[PDB]
Symmetry: C2
Subunit: 199 residues, 2 copies
């Protein structure tokens, strides 16, 4: 089983005017592509070190594995969290849970925006599901640290706040990026991930 | 392979009165044993995750691997750094390097003691060799984080400043433990590690 770069499910310009084609092309075809390849390189190095019982080599490889492995996990989710058919508000059981756990959909938006804007440096904001508590939970992660691998929460919706995700279009003004991205959220996909947690 | 607890190179009471037999027996047969057992469990989980390509599981296993893997690496070195015939000062090229890089043996002791006393929480102090710079270097490490795996420095002499290493005998007074341990340093072993660094 070798990881592979997934195709983007839509045209590079499908998210205009909210996210321009230049960002989408660079973010997918350059940034994500590097993560998959570097993840595969690290896994092959780790397999060799593991078979030899070289614990020092295993530990030295952990930063590259989390960085590149998280990069592959996060971006693969991110593309599915967006869609030209997205935007608006969710419906059904997910909307009920958002209202129950955050008060309202608008309050949820404020909390996830605050967590995403609040990331100092590189990282991600996540809406997740806490399996043990059986409810939604917002968390932020640094760099490419993935939500489930580092927190156990199941990712539902991720907002990439790496500068490369918005800088070409919005420059330093990250809040302008957060406003635009709500128009392309694929709530159908987020619902599928949420419903997969409930049985 | 499967990691195994190495035999101690001497009796548990060989370091009296500086480190008592109760500490040595607990530290080796309980603390270190747990690291080996848990390290083997974590390595087996990682092998399974690698074959399935489960990157999330790999990343979730990193804390146990570094903690237990570092514990096995670190403690195995610590036992060899001590000897009932130890103490005093080194000789030959190692003493020359200590004088060159730290000024004198006494100044080296002050610096490594300060770094070891300066550890806030659990961790380790290390004298290492920087291969790229070709000289000695003092560093501190948190928890069981190993020197080479996390810094690239080759370990020469390690001082375990975890509370379990000295609390039974010295209680909260870590400086008394740090002073006593110099009497049992196996400079012969540290010298072997140093010469292994040089061609
Ligand atoms: Mn990105
Ligand atoms: Mn210890």
């Amino acid at each position: 089983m070798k990881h592979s770069l997934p195709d983007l499910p839509y045209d590079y310009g499908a998210l205009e005017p909210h996210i321009n084609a230049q960002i989408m092309q660079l973010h997918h075809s350059k940034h994500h592509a590097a993560f998959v390849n570097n993840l595969n390189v690290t896994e092959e190095k780790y397999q060799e070190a593991l078979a030899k019982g070289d614990v020092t080599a295993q530990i030295a490889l952990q930063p590259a594995l989390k960085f590149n492995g998280g990069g592959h996990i996060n971006h693969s989710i991110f593309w599915t969290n967006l869609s030209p058919n997205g935007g608006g508000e969710p419906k059904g059981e997910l909307l009920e849970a958002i209202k129950r756990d955050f008060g309202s959909f608008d309050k949820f938006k404020e909390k996830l925006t605050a967590a995403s804007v609040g990331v100092q440096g590189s990282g991600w904001g996540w809406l997740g599901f806490n399996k043990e508590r059986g409810h939604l939970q917002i968390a932020a992660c640094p760099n490419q640290d993935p939500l489930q691998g580092t927190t156990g929460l199941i990712p539902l919706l991720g907002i990439d706040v790496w500068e490369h995700a918005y800088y070409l279009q919005y420059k330093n003004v990250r809040p302008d990026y957060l406003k635009a991205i709500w128009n392309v959220i694929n709530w159908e996909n987020v619902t599928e991930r949420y419903m997969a947690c409930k049985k």
